[PDB]
């Protein structure tokens, strides 16, 4: 499923970051980086879900995870 983060999507993300030229190796590297981020956030998120004795991870849990990783998110309160 990691290959579903396609090459043109990563290029577009880099474009928003102002990048003009991209080595071919960024994509796999970026994917690895992306995976780590998701794991970390979800690890906290699922813990919150588990704490509430729920089976559905909610958007709030993710927002809380982001806040606690120093990446506070606005708009989903």
């Amino acid at each position: 499923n990691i290959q579903g983060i396609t090459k043109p999507a990563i290029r577009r993300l880099a474009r928003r970051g102002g990048v003009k030229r991209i080595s071919g190796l960024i994509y796999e590297e970026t994917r690895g980086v992306l995976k780590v981020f998701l794991e970390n956030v979800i690890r906290d998120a699922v813990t919150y879900t588990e704490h509430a004795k729920r089976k559905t991870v909610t958007a709030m849990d993710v927002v809380y995870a982001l806040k606690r990783q120093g990446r506070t998110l606005y708009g989903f309160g």
């Binding site: 981020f37 998701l38 956030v41 089976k55 559905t56 991870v57 958007a59 927002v63 998110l73 989903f76």
Partner: peptide, 19 residues
Amino acid sequence: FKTDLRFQSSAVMALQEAC
């Protein structure tokens, strides 16, 4: 991480904005 999890739509949208 956890079996049988479901997700709210807005949870996935939150994840997309954050990522």
